[PDB]
């Protein structure tokens, strides 16, 4: 007997156009976004790739083949049941991680990361090296480099890459980074991969009783044409619990909440409505919590949720220490080189009265720095961020040419 629990952790998977994308998660999980997702999504447009999978490790068997994903501990000559472990969730970027459409949404979700790089591809790959950059900028705790396409080339050439990876990871934040040989469209050493996922990207440490905070990443009016008024419920909220515990029947609010349309000015009056329900993937749960992705039932006017309206917001408890600021101050230390198309450019330090792009967890606001110092500056954002911890991390971007590109990171000071 294996218990049905909500995901408990969250791992993102990125890399160049190097294969397999969704295929690797699929090689670990099953059916999900973004073409179907059942029984979850009844249609959609673009967005990210989400899939959670059970993970159990079999005691009777031998490492690493002892690692399983379902209760069928067959391939070890024993009828014994595994020891139920974790409920890992996987999220990936179908083409929005970096360089295009920066939201940081899923980026704040990373309890770890998998940098996949095809072995048939010369390392380091252009786009992949900038992927490794964001992993240090957004500071994803615990990552692993998975050599894909290992089946394409000899182990010996599979080591010509190993060199280059170790060579690329000389004196960086990741020296003990794992490099896992794995196969794409085929299932080779995937279980060993699991092992590492169970060692390097370990089950996180959290505090059961802290400030419940969820981060709206999408919202939609679930009622489709033909739902009669007598029978319908307020649109749900996407997002993910980052701290604390949420329950049904529990009163919460979203910040900054609803914008105010009056006079010649504009503000934001936070929206107060309760949690109708919880539901992780297929099943409908009872007490939302960190790890994995969730969707919350509500009493809002669906007009408010429809079309990912609230996304980039933040769900917090009915009443709490929830500073919403039209001006922020962040310590920092930016980079010196910006990579991308063609070759890396020379990026100057933050300029005064300049408009930068600030991504705070689930949000991405453009603000103007109203005073610069060495380790710190103040930014006049156009949309009120909803700070909550002196430790929160913001990603700064500057529009060099057409759009914005990551240039540094810093903590919000309050
Ligand atoms: N977790 C959870 N999600 C719910 C619940 N009720 C409705 N939903 C959400 O409603 C969605 C149903 O999809 P759909 O009604 O077609 O809206 P949509 O995904 O925006 C599709 P379209 O873009 O065509 O309008 C699911 O993805 C699910 O997240 C619930 O009680 N719990």
Curated annotation (Swiss-Prot):
PANTHER family the record matches: EUKARYOTIC TRANSLATION INITIATION FACTOR 2 SUBUNIT 3 FAMILY MEMBER (PTHR42854), EUKARYOTIC TRANSLATION INITIATION FACTOR 2 SUBUNIT 3-RELATED (PTHR42854:SF3)
Catalytic activity: GTP + H2O = GDP + phosphate + H(+)
Family indicated by similarity: Belongs to the TRAFAC class translation factor GTPase superfamily. Classic translation factor GTPase family. EIF2G subfamily.
InterPro entries: eIF2G, eIF2g_C, eIF2g_dom_2, eIF2g_GTP-bd, P-loop_NTPase, Small_GTP-bd, T_Tr_GTP-bd_dom, TIF2_gsu
Record's subunit section: Heterotrimer composed of an alpha, a beta and a gamma chain.
Annotated residues for binding of Mg(2+) 2: 18, 43
Name of the protein: Translation initiation factor 2 subunit gamma
Sequence segments annotated as region (G5): 183-185
Organism: Saccharolobus solfataricus (strain ATCC 35092 / DSM 1617 / JCM 11322 / P2)
Binding positions for Mg(2+) 1 per the UniProt entry: 22, 45
UniProt: Zn(2+) binding residues: 58, 61, 73, 76
Pfam families named in the record: eIF2_C (PF09173), GTP_EFTU (PF00009)
Limits of the tr-type G domain: 6-205
Enzyme class: hydrolase
GO molecular function terms listed in the Swiss-Prot or TrEMBL record: GTP binding; GTPase activity; metal ion binding; translation elongation factor activity; translation initiation factor activity; tRNA binding
Coiled-coil annotated spans: none
Protein's UniProt keywords contain Nucleus: no
Residue ranges of the region described as G3: 92-95
Region (G4): 148-151
NCBIfam families: eif2g_arch, PRK04000.1, small_GTP
G2: annotated segments: 43-47
Location of region: G1: 15-22
